Design an enzyme around this catalytic site. Structure first.
Site, PDB file in Angstrom:
ATOM      1  N   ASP A 154      41.938  36.799  35.301  1.00  0.00           N
ATOM      2  CA  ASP A 154      42.592  37.338  36.533  1.00  0.00           C
ATOM      3  C   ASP A 154      41.763  37.044  37.773  1.00  0.00           C
ATOM      4  O   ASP A 154      41.424  37.992  38.497  1.00  0.00           O
ATOM      5  CB  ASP A 154      42.861  38.843  36.428  1.00  0.00           C
ATOM      6  CG  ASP A 154      43.814  39.365  37.496  1.00  0.00           C
ATOM      7  OD1 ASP A 154      44.658  38.563  38.006  1.00  0.00           O
ATOM      8  OD2 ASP A 154      43.694  40.552  37.809  1.00  0.00           O
ATOM      9  N   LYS A 156      41.304  35.966  41.456  1.00  0.00           N
ATOM     10  CA  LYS A 156      42.057  35.873  42.728  1.00  0.00           C
ATOM     11  C   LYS A 156      41.144  36.330  43.848  1.00  0.00           C
ATOM     12  O   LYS A 156      40.301  37.199  43.641  1.00  0.00           O
ATOM     13  CB  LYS A 156      43.360  36.686  42.667  1.00  0.00           C
ATOM     14  CG  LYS A 156      43.222  38.157  42.290  1.00  0.00           C
ATOM     15  CD  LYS A 156      44.583  38.912  42.144  1.00  0.00           C
ATOM     16  CE  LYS A 156      44.408  40.374  41.788  1.00  0.00           C
ATOM     17  NZ  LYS A 156      45.674  41.118  41.536  1.00  0.00           N
ATOM     18  N   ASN A 159      40.373  40.041  44.269  1.00  0.00           N
ATOM     19  CA  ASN A 159      39.491  40.795  43.353  1.00  0.00           C
ATOM     20  C   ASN A 159      38.102  40.161  43.331  1.00  0.00           C
ATOM     21  O   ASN A 159      37.328  40.441  42.402  1.00  0.00           O
ATOM     22  CB  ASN A 159      40.118  40.976  41.978  1.00  0.00           C
ATOM     23  CG  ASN A 159      41.215  42.021  41.895  1.00  0.00           C
ATOM     24  OD1 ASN A 159      41.732  42.248  40.806  1.00  0.00           O
ATOM     25  ND2 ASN A 159      41.570  42.692  42.992  1.00  0.00           N
ATOM     26  N   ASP A 172      37.229  44.084  38.446  1.00  0.00           N
ATOM     27  CA  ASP A 172      38.508  44.228  37.712  1.00  0.00           C
ATOM     28  C   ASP A 172      38.558  43.276  36.511  1.00  0.00           C
ATOM     29  O   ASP A 172      39.112  42.107  36.574  1.00  0.00           O
ATOM     30  CB  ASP A 172      39.719  44.085  38.619  1.00  0.00           C
ATOM     31  CG  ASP A 172      41.006  44.234  37.835  1.00  0.00           C
ATOM     32  OD1 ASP A 172      40.938  44.791  36.736  1.00  0.00           O
ATOM     33  OD2 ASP A 172      42.040  43.789  38.324  1.00  0.00           O
ATOM     34  N   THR A 189      48.388  36.282  37.604  1.00  0.00           N
ATOM     35  CA  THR A 189      49.291  36.303  38.781  1.00  0.00           C
ATOM     36  C   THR A 189      49.884  34.912  38.838  1.00  0.00           C
ATOM     37  O   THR A 189      49.215  33.952  38.486  1.00  0.00           O
ATOM     38  CB  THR A 189      48.559  36.821  40.034  1.00  0.00           C
ATOM     39  OG1 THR A 189      49.517  37.135  41.045  1.00  0.00           O
ATOM     40  CG2 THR A 189      47.568  35.826  40.602  1.00  0.00           C
TER      41      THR A 189
END
Ligand SMILES: Nc1ncnc2c1ncn2[C@@H]1O[C@H](COP(=O)(O)OP(=O)(O)NP(=O)(O)O)[C@@H](O)[C@H]1O
Ligand SMILES: [Mg+2]
Lengths: 338, 12
Positions: A154, A156, A159, A172, A189
């Site tokens: 994840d 991005k 984060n 995260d 995402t």
């Protein structure tokens, strides 16, 4: 060689904490709540201040009822188990964790500079040196995580937090997972999804190197390589095997990105015989001192404005709801291990 | 026209 012995050490530490996890090291009434920094489907992150020490922390609160209701019980137990187990200069540190009748709580060091997303959107795009400074910290961080059999899954700008020295703190581990071979879960995402995830193939740690390619592209362009108004249209571009670059991109950046944004896994940088060294020894990173980055000795290209302990000016404003704690314990069975 | 709004991550 110095790298292999550092990571051998790191694996031992990770494994002891993984096997014997920290549990219940504080409680809600030891903290004042100040402000919501972020939100998710089963809770929120709040700036809090430890009453005794006066230290600020970021407190992630998860509603056990909503966690069970959305069938992410494993995902949250797992997030906390990993976070309590890792230790790296570009990973946010968990300080405390506990639960009560209604909620799970993870108390992290507060990263006051806010999200890379904010800075990136405000300035529009980063210079190659600025993007390179951040990219090197992610390369070292994925090197660390992958050596523990963790896939992060994840990545991005949202984060990746910027600390008081202008370095990255990855936050995260919501989708992070310990994986020996392949795993299959569809998560992330849309704009950061690796093609092998979209195509429901079993995938490995190489999805993180694809995601690194999306991040570097986005940091240097101000927008990601694959976007559209509908997810399915993004997925078509991702799997297509085609990427366009802005003409302002350096030839070395384009080359690195063609090698990370490789649909073909036998050809993707990070996934070849030489592993992460294909990335570390690429010409775009020629001027990068990997030890100096790890030792946080390089001068950041940018330091967020910091107006004193507990400044939240770098963070967006979210609606401040009451933190209701039930008189009756809920889901106590399901979150024994937390 | 790229939508520059912050992105949600989801599993399944
Ligand atoms: N240690 C921290 N210090 C400061 N802010 C933090 C910290 N951890 C999380 N946040 C903020 O809280 C936001 C959400 O945290 P996160 O754990 O990513 O929750 P999420 O439910 O995945 N939401 P999001 O990623 O925003 O879609 C982050 O993007 C930060 O803005
Ligand atoms: Mg998140």
């Amino acid at each position: 060689n110095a790298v292999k012995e550092f990571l051998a050490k790191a694996k031992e530490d990770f494994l002891k904490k993984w096997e014997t996890p920290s549990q219940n090291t504080a409680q809600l009434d030891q903290f004042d709540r100040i402000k919501t920094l972020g939100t998710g489907s089963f809770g929120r992150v709040m700036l809090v201040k430890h009453k005794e020490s006066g230290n600020h922390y970021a407190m992630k609160i998860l509603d056990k009822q909503k966690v069970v209701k959305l069938k992410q019980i494993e995902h949250t137990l797992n997030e906390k188990r990993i976070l309590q187990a890792v230790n790296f200069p570009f990973l946010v540190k968990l300080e405390f964790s506990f639960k009560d009748n209604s909620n799970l709580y993870m108390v992290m060091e507060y990263v006051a500079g806010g999200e890379m997303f904010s800075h990136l959107r405000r300035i529009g795009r980063f210079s190659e040196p600025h993007a390179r400074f951040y990219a090197a910290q992610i390369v070292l961080t994925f090197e660390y995580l992958h050596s523990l059999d963790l896939i992060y899954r994840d990545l991005k700008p949202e984060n990746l937090l910027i600390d008081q020295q202008g370095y990255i703190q990855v936050t995260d581990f919501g989708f992070a997972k310990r994986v020996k071979g392949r795993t299959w879960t569809l998560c992330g995402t849309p704009e950061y999804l690796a093609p092998e995830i979209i195509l429901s193939k079993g995938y490995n740690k190489a999805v993180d190197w694809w995601a690194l390619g999306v991040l570097i592209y986005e940091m240097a362009a101000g927008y990601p390589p694959f976007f559209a108004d509908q997810p399915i249209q993004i997925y078509e571009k991702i799997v297509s095997g085609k990427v366009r670059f802005p003409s302002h991109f350096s030839s070395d950046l384009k080359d690195l990105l063609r090698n990370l944004l490789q649909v073909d896994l036998t050809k993707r940088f990070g996934n070849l015989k030489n592993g992460v060294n294909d990335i570390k020894n690429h010409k775009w990173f020629a001027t990068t001192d990997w030890i100096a980055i790890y030792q946080r000795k390089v001068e950041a290209p940018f330091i967020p404005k910091f107006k004193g302990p507990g400044d939240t000016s770098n963070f967006d404003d979210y609606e401040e709801e009451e933190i209701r704690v039930s008189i009756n314990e809920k889901c106590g069975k399901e979150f024994t291990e937390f | 026209l790229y939508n520059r709004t912050r992105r949600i991550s989801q599993t399944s």
